[PDB]
From a paper:
Like all ABC transporters, ECF transporters contain two cytosolic ATPases (often a heterodimer of EcfA and EcfA’) and two transmembrane domains, the latter with unique architectures. The single membrane subunit EcfT and the two ATPases together form the so-called energy-coupling factor or ECF module. Substrate binding in ECF transporters is mediated by the second integral membrane subunit, termed S-component. While in ‘group I’ ECF transporters the ECF module is dedicated for interaction with a single S-component, in group II ECF transporters, the same ECF module can associate with different S-components, and hence be used to assist the transport of different substrates.
One of the selected nanobodies (Nb81) bound with high affinity to the ECF module, and the ECF-PanT-Nb81 complex formed well-diffracting crystals. We solved a crystal structure of the complex at a resolution of 2.8 Å, the highest resolution for any ECF-transporter structure to date. In the crystals, the asymmetric unit contains two copies of the ECF-PanT-Nb81 complex. The nanobodies are positioned centrally in the asymmetric unit, making extensive contacts with both copies of ECF-PanT in the unit, but do not participate in crystal contacts with proteins in neighbouring asymmetric units. An elaborate network of hydrogen bonds, electrostatic interactions, cation-π and π-π interactions between the nanobody and EcfA and EcfA’ seems to stabilise the protein in a single conformation, which may have aided crystal formation. In all these protein complexes, the two ATPase subunits (EcfA and EcfA’) are separated from each other, adopting an open conformation, which has been interpreted as a post-hydrolysis state. While on a global level, PanT and FolT2 share conserved six-helix topologies, and both S-components are in the inward-oriented toppled state in complex with the ECF module, there are two prominent differences between the proteins. First, only helices 1 and 2 superimpose well in the ECF-FolT2 and ECF-PanT complexes, with the positions of helices 3–6 deviating substantially by up to 10 Å (when the structures are aligned on the coupling helices). In PanT, the latter helices are oriented more perpendicular to the predicted membrane plane (less toppled) than in FolT2. Second, the predicted substrate-binding site in ECF-PanT is located in a largely occluded cavity with a volume of 880 Å3, whereas in ECF-FolT2 the site is fully accessible from the cytoplasmic side of the membrane. Since pantothenate was not added at any stage during purification and crystallisation the density likely belongs to a molecule from the crystallisation condition, most probably citrate, which was present at a concentration of 70 mM.
Author numbering:
A (entry chain A): 1 to 280
B (entry chain G): 1 to 283
C (entry chain H): 1 to 207
D (entry chain I): 6 to 265
E (entry chain E): 1 to 126
Write the structure that this text describes.
């Protein structure tokens, strides 16, 4: 008990066609205000987590499981309440665009919430600005890069003021500068709004920066902890099939060269200073 | 056999949309069996150049000499069937190509069109399916029953099964998790080792450093530099003035060196970087 | 399993939108599958195949609605961009452009209900083939039948000032062309529709 | 994307509903025209419209060019009336009613007019605006068991994906050609065969699109069409009177110069 | 559209009760989710309660949970806050805030609310 916004409790889920559960007795919390990352391989139960947090997928035994978002228990009567609280940027940049233009696409959620139009104009302008899309305020998605359309998705998510933003493989199809753009922007949004980010990813750099990293293996929670705690455990992740971020790899290689560095070093800047201090 | 662009210029009709970019007096020649990387910032001409290997877009000036074929501005579309049996394009997110009732039939498709028999194509698809790591029970599924990664492997089999002497891949690891991309690059390195030439068009500079042998740097339909990875990543000033990236181990080399560490040589890979750190630490 | 009717209702909406987008692409763009023996005469469209895929997917009332959209496309196009003389002579009429197409869509959805009703997986591709068949056949037949009631009986088509006798002989050449193209198209559409409908069931395994 | 160019002249200030209704009604009037006075009337009113937008000639030759050959086909088929070729007496014969070439100049007219006004609609109106106009026109269907809200949404999404699915449609074709697929080789026999490597991809694609869109839409609180505000609206303006003057005159000039 | 007016604050004895009222004027409250907040003299502003535009969802802080009850009066374009068992600590300035971007829910946080009233002061002691 430490002020968690999301608490996944005893969730099992079998895709309807598939024979086996995609998630088995999975329980985890999300510390309010954190940026935690979910990572996993082949078992890819994380691909199921976002659509469960927000309600698109139900669990298997609603009597035994319970998801809770911002104090609201996810149920039949509260699905929409909860979706106001948990906003999701999704993987494919196109196919997330409803509107024929940027501004229309941001306006969609306000419309869904019956926001009086004079408010909407102000809101859509502010969001589209906050993502640096005012040059393309009236542009058609067929003329926008994937980096832009991920920004525009982010913007429409922003206009509804959610309590948690999930990036559900949101950088996975983007050019690396686009990955940094989208990551920086969601960091800026998180600071400027005191939000929580759930990142569902295979970008180990992305998860390297998370306050918390949960490891998912075959639909169960293999391990969980700060990146400085999780990513040094090279053997565990290698067996799951996961890699590790660049810094933890360079540290491990240096170890295979004989040079041993501590676990707490977890940063480009920290490491540079470490090797600096060794040469003097 | 070696690829050669003779003053190759491709221009879209003048006065037409600017976002589709041409090729301006391209002059280079690729080696017969090595691994070439097509790099360039968005808006460069990679996609456009890549279609010339395929004779999808014929040039407007100069000649292209690929496989046994010469592709002039007047080359017709009749005999392309044999050039494409030799020179194969692998498009991006190619799981979209998949369409047959069985995985196996869709892999066989390529062979069939290029003149393999029933039995010849069946065996040629069954080989590469195993090469791309597909389980055996999925050989008779629909390609649409499979996951995105599996789908992508079936897409790649179907363009490699007829074993073209030249394969031009366009970002074949998009969306693949850390290890799957490693599998992808390993499979493509093995195919390079077997004696075929491989042109890889990618945004990840680390892939280039770890695997490429030669680099075509394209910018605004012009070749700006043509050389090995060790040479292209040598100058941070040049890249910064050309909006090009560096391998992350090269950036860490530069962070240590701007932080005054006497790292020897040009470390591009993580092993080379760790080595240079070890060699710089003592003496 | 939360607000299920909304999941399905919104998916209905999107499936409709993407099928309208494909229909507009097929109608206003000269698609590759658009095969013509003689340029400017009535050709074999891949459009009944599209109506049939969507009719099997969604249903008879939905297929009827898609057929009405198809016919509205043909009507708009007939006035605004006629491809040949068969469009100017026949498809500027709301009876001949709309009712046959709406009829085909309804029929194709009825046929798809069969494959819905047959549990064995192989025997579904059979019923899908029936739906591609009906989507081409009901369209071509009812276009001929209503061109008979509207324009043959009264060869005052305003197409031309063609002699009523000459108008009839022209309409007989036209209807024969319609029948021959319709048999070809009926078989093309009856073969290809299962090739599209079954992959779609596969890609739709979830929800 | 009907190649809508933006502009600032009064055509762009007319509410799209008025423009759609005027293009429909103007077409109707092209139909109820017969006497030479009525054709001079439709042509003076229509070319008045056309020179009133301000697009010079080059926009219109691009709009009409695909037609001009089927235009002259439908023109000569009409001039000769029944005969495909009027072998007997090749040239002019009568004086009081000259010849029947004037009749095929009416097909030149009717084609031109419907084309011209259709492109004014297409070039100077946003695709979503054209959509919103058609949706307004359908709003009377509410009195039946109809929901014009989801129809408007369908039209909007569709028009938004029309260029996206077109690009994907081209890319699949190039991928399959790169596997050595042939799309113009044999007769219909196998030219029919060659479509499946393009058709199964496109639907599989579009079904995935539909699935992702519904997933997102419900993610952002899409409960249906009833109960939701509207970001894009359509306000009538005083400029819109000008079309009324345009149309009532055309009624008055047509009906009274029309055959009695 | 901010003209929010709190009312009904004043002095009341410990264990007593009173009802605050948040009224709009020039716009309708139903277009806005309404949150009640409360800033003590030396504390930070504290979200205490709130109601959704649907009017179906309500949130209370653990401080006021079980004593305060919020309500939308559609007919009167007001949102009422009913404070019972008032304890000395409840004494503070009380503010109502409005934001349109939620229909089905509401949150008790200062950040998301865009339009505030000027606060009415409630004092409980004797
Ligand atoms: C120089 C000649 C070489 C030409 C190369 C030909 C390429 C190889 C063709 C093999 C088959 C591929 O094309 C294939 O067509 C047939 C018939 O439409 C389909 O076959 C399937 O459906 C058909 C008709 O619906 C049924 O009769 C049959 O039971 C089933 O197998 C396949 O689903 C399609 O993928
Ligand atoms: C002018 C261009 C048109 C573009 C838009 C048209 C595309 C429409 C595609 C068909 C509509 C989607 O499918 C729609 O959903 C279901 C069928 O599952 C039916 O559902 C309907 O039932 C009846 C209609 O008589 C009504 O009482 C009910 O309120 C309505 O929802 C609709 O009758 C059908 O129209
Ligand atoms: C005397 C009994 C009837 C004679 C036999 C049946 C002939 C049918 C006539 C043609 C079709 C009737 O069409 C119905 O009527 C009106 C005329 O007001 C149509 O109007 C339409 O038809 C005509 C025919 O090209 C066009 O010139 C007109 O521009 C078009 O809009 C309606 O769109 C339709 O609902
Ligand atoms: C209800 C309102 C609107 C209904 C009509 C919908 C029409 C839909 C057509 C949209 C076309 C898709 O987008 C389309 O892109 C391509 C190229 O990028 C262009 O069209 C392309 O095919 C044409 C066909 O002759 C070629 O001659 C041309 O060289 C090429 O550019 C179109 O000009 C553009 O509009």
């Amino acid at each position: 008990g430490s002020d968690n916004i999301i608490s996944f409790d005893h969730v099992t889920f079998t895709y309807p066609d598939s024979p086996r559960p995609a998630l088995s007795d999975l329980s985890f919390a999300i510390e309010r205000g954190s940026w935690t990352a979910l990572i996993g391989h082949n078992g890819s139960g994380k691909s199921t987590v976002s659509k469960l947090i927000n309600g698109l997928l139900a669990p298997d035994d609603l009597d035994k499981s319970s998801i809770t978002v911002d104090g609201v228990k996810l149920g039949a009567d509260t699905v929409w309440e909860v979706r106001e609280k948990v906003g999701i940027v999704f993987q494919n940049p196109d196919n997330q665009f409803v509107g024929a233009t940027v501004s229309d696409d941001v306006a969609f959620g306000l419309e869904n919430r019956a926001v009086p139009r004079p408010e909407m104009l102000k809101i859509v302008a502010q969001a589209v600005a906050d993502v640096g899309m005012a040059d393309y305020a009236d542009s058609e998605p067929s003329n926008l890069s994937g980096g832009q359309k991920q920004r525009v998705a982010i913007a429409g998510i922003l206009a509804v003021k959610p309590q948690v933003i999930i990036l559900d493989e949101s950088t996975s199809m983007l050019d690396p500068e686009g990955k940094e753009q989208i990551l920086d922007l969601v960091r800026k949004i998180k600071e400027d709004n005191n939000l929580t980010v759930i990142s569902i990813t295979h970008d180990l750099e992305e998860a390297a920066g998370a306050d918390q990293v949960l490891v998912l293996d075959d639909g169960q929670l293999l391990d969980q902890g700060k990146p400085e705690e999780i990513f040094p455990k090279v053997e565990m992740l290698k067996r799951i099939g996961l890699d590790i971020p660049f810094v933890y790899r360079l540290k491990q290689l240096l170890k295979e060269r004989g040079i041993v560095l501590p676990d707490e070093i977890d940063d480009d800047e920290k490491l540079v200073q470490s090797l600096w201090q060794l040469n003097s | 056999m070696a690829i050669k662009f003779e003053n190759v210029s491709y221009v879209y009709s003048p006065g037409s949309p600017l976002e589709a970019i041409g090729l301006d007096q391209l002059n280079f020649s690729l080696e017969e069996g090595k691994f070439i990387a097509l790099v360039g910032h968005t808006g460069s001409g990679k996609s456009t150049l890549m279609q010339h290997f395929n004779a999808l877009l014929k040039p407007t000036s100069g000649k292209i000499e690929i496989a046994g074929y010469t592709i002039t501005p007047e080359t017709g579309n009749k005999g392309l069937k044999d050039l494409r049996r030799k020179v194969s394009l692998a498009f991006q997110f190619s799981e979209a190509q998949l369409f047959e009732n069985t995985v196996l039939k869709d892999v066989e498709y390529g062979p069939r069109n290029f003149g393999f028999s029933e039995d010849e194509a069946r065996e040629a698809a069954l080989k590469w399916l195993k090469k791309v790591g597909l389980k055996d029970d999925l050989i008779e599924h629909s390609p649409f029953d499979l996951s995105g990664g599996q789908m992508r492997r079936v897409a790649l089999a179907g363009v490699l099964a007829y074993e073209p002497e030249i394969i031009c891949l366009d970002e074949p690891a998009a969306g693949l998790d850390p290890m799957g991309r490693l599998e992808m690059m390993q499979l493509f390195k093995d195919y390079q080792a077997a004696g075929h030439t491989v042109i890889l068009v990618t945004h990840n500079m680390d892939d280039v450093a770890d695997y490429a042998d030669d680099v075509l740097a394209l910018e605004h339909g012009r070749l700006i530099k043509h050389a090995s990875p060790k040479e292209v990543f040598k100058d941070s000033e040049w890249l910064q003035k050309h909006h090009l990236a560096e391998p992350r181990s090269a950036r860490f080399a530069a962070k240590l060196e701007a932080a005054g560490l006497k790292l020897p040589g040009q470390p591009l890979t993580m092993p080379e970087l760790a080595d240079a750190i070890k060699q710089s630490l003592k003496g | 399993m939360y607000d299920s009717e909304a999941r399905q209702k919104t998916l209905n909406l999107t499936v409709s939108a993407v099928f309208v987008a494909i229909l507009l692409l097929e109608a206003f763009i000269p698609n590759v599958g658009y095969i013509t023996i003689l340029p400017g005469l009535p050709a074999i469209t891949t459009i009944p195949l599209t109506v049939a895929v969507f009719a099997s997917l969604r249903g008879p009332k939905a297929g009827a609605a898609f057929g009405l959209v198809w016919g509205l496309t043909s009507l708009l196009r007939a006035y605004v961009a006629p491809n040949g003389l068969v469009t100017i002579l026949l498809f500027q009429n709301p009876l001949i452009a709309l009712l046959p197409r709406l009829a085909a869509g309804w029929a194709a959805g009825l046929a798809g209900q069969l494959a819905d009703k047959w549990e064995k997986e192989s025997r579904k591709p059979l019923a899908y083939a029936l739906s591609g068949l009906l989507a081409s056949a009901v369209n071509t037949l009812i276009v001929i039948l209503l061109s008979d009631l509207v324009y043959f009986i009264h060869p005052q088509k305003l197409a031309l000032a063609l002699g009523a006798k000459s108008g009839q002989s022209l309409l007989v050449i036209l209807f024969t062309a319609l029948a021959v193209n319709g048999i070809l198209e009926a078989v093309f559409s009856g073969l290809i529709t299962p090739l599209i409908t079954a992959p779609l069931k596969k890609r739709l395994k979830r929800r | 994307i009907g190649r809508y160019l933006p502009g600032t002249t009064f055509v762009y200030r007319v509410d799209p509903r008025a423009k759609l209704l005027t293009t429909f009604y103007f077409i109707i009037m092209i139909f109820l025209a017969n006497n030479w006075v009525s054709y001079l009337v439709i042509s003076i009113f229509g070319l008045a419209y056309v020179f009133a937008t301000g697009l010079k000639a080059r926009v219109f030759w691009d709009g009409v060019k695909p037609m001009i050959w089927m235009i002259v086909f439908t023109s000569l088929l009409q001039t000769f009336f029944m005969a495909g070729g009027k072998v007997y007496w090749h040239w002019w014969i009568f004086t009081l009613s000259s010849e029947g070439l004037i009749n095929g100049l009416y097909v030149f007219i009717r084609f031109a007019m419907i084309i011209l006004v259709s492109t004014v609609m297409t070039v100077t109106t946003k695709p979503l605006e054209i959509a919103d106009a058609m949706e307004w026109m359908l709003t009377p269907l509410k009195l039946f068991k109809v929901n014009v809200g989801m129809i408007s949404l369908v039209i909007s999404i569709a028009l938004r994906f029309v260029p996206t699915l077109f690009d994907q449609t081209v890319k699949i074709m190039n991928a399959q050609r790169s596997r050595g697929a042939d799309f113009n080789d044999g007769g219909l026999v196998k030219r029919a065969k060659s479509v499946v490597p393009m058709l199964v991809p496109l639907f599989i694609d579009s079904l995935e699109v539909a699935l992702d869109l519904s997933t997102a839409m419900e993610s952002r609180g899409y409960k249906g069409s009833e109960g939701r505000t509207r970001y894009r609206i359509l306000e009538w303006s005083k400029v819109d009177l000008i079309p009324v003057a345009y149309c009532l005159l055309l009624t008055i000039l047509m009906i009274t110069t029309r055959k009695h | 559209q901010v003209q929010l007016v709190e009312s009904g604050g004043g002095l009341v004895q410990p264990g007593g009760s009173l009802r605050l009222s948040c009224t709009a004027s020039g716009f309708t409250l139903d277009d806005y989710a309404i949150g009640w907040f409360r800033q003590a003299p030396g504390k930070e502003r504290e979200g205490i309660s709130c109601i959704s535009r649907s009017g179906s969802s309500t949130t209370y802080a653990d401080s006021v949970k079980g004593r305060f009850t919020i309500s939308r009066d559609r007919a009167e374009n007001t949102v009422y806050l009913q404070m019972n068992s008032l304890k000395p600590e409840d004494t503070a300035d009380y503010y109502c805030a409005a934001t349109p971007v939620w229909y089905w829910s509401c949150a008790v946080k200062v950040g998301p609310y865009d339009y505030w009233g000027q606060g009415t002061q409630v004092t409980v002691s004797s």
